[PDB]
Design a protein around this nucleic acid. Structure first.
Length: 50
DNA sequence: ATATATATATATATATATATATATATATATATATATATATATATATATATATATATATAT
C-alpha cells in the first residue's frame, strides 16, 4: 500500500471503491472520521492521546 | 460459544425552502335565447238593411 496506489484508486472511483478495497486487501484500515483513526494510532503505538 | 448491553456507520424518513403547474372561488362581461309587449291585419260572429222568392191581409 502506497500513496500513489491510493491516488490511482481514487482517480478510478470515489469513497466506495476504497471501501471495497478495504475488504479486498489485507492489513489495511480506513476511517471516514479522524477520531477512530487516532484511536487506532493510539492502540498501535501504546500511548495516551496526549 | 451464545445472551445481552453499548457504540459506530449507514440508510431512511421528515422538515424546510423554492419553482412550476393546476384548481377553485369570485367577479365581470358577453351573448343567446326566451318570453313578453306591441302593433297590425284578418277572421268570425252578430246586427241591420236591402234584395230575391213566396204568400196573405186590407180596402172598396
Amino acid at each position: 500500500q502506497t500513496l500513489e496506489h491510493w491516488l490511482n484508486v481514487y482517480h478510478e472511483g470515489g469513497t466506495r471503491l476504497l471501501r471495497q478495497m478495504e475488504k479486498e486487501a489485507i492489513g489495511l484500515w480506513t476511517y471516514p472520521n479522524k477520531k477512530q483513526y487516532l484511536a487506532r494510532l493510539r492502540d498501535f503505538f501504546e500511548v495516551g492521546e496526549n
